[PDB]
Amino acid sequence: PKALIVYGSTTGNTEYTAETIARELADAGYEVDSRDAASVEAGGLFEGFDLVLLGCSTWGDDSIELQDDFIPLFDSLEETGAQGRKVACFGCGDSSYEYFCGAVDAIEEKLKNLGAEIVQDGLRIDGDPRAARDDIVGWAHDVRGAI
Amino acid sequence: PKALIVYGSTTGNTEYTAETIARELADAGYEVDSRDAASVEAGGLFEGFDLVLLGCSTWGDDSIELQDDFIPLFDSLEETGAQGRKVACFGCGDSSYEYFCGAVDAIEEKLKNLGAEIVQDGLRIDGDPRAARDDIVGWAHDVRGAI
Ligand SMILES: Cc1cc2nc3c(=O)[nH]c(=O)nc-3n(C[C@H](O)[C@H](O)[C@H](O)CO)c2cc1C
Ligand SMILES: Cc1cc2nc3c(=O)[nH]c(=O)nc-3n(C[C@H](O)[C@H](O)[C@H](O)CO)c2cc1C
């Protein structure tokens, strides 16, 4: 099948995460398209894809603010072709903050409001994702078995 | 009890195996509903059934491919009501191929991932099922004790 991976990454963590999940789907036969959210246009972005995975980090001094490159996509989520789409979300964060991986919850909530089909609960990585490689590959294997 | 048998059969071998099982269960007092996958709709197919038996043959030039009539169902297995359902698989194939009854493995795996309860290891027949009538009968007897 074809999978789209769109990520907003500032420090390289979410990018590394996206890339580890990309390699696992490609190994299972998927044709994978991995894109930085800074370079995509929301209008019809998901058309033609069997599975869409969205990843983003959480920022903000008081509230949950999504990663800067992802904000425009989030704000135009209704024009992407999400209704009825198989999607799953991922993000890196730090459990010391009150809303750990709060960007995953905000994206999952909006996607459910748009009628997307959430295939698996969001992968939330605390600290260095390189330390959690195993959880990352494990979650990729689970989203694949479900669809 | 009520059992549903859904099979994808091209040459008649998976069909004959489905029919032999159906008679064994009917003989043990079950109400059996046997259907060709070509005539079924996936939405809620398993509702109201105590036991669901899925049979499929394996094709494909180099990859393992499901029998054509079963493909649509397999692709929509998440809408059948498999979660918590007691199921078991069966299929005909040929040991000269690299993935002997590979469709049986693919279907068990997906059911597992959907939270179905696999009640007995799948029945894999090499060659003419007419020649393995005893294994068929013995397996149908074994699924009866497990439910
Ligand atoms: C100002 C600021 C706010 C952050 N807010 C959060 C947060 O709300 N939840 C979270 O999981 N991580 C938060 N982080 C961690 C951030 O997503 C990132 O994971 C690390 O700073 C880079 O590894 C924050 C970091 C900064 C600098
Ligand atoms: C082109 C082709 C591919 C087949 N692939 C398989 C396979 O991968 N595994 C298997 O057990 N049988 C395979 N079979 C046998 C097939 O499922 C079938 O059992 C017999 O032709 C009748 O059941 C194949 C048959 C054909 C013609």
UniProtKB/Swiss-Prot annotation, chain B:
Alphabetically ordered keywords of this record: Electron transport, Flavoprotein, FMN, Transport
Cleavable signal peptide: none
Residue ranges annotated for the Flavodoxin-like domain, each copy included: 3-144
Requisite cofactors: FMN
Gene3D superfamilies attached to this UniProt entry: 3.40.50.360
Keyword match Transferase: no
Pfam family, one: Flavodoxin_1
Record has Plastid as a keyword: no
One annotated GO molecular function: FMN binding
Stated role: Low-potential electron donor to a number of redox enzymes.
Family to which this protein belongs: Belongs to the flavodoxin family.
Protein name (database record): Flavodoxin
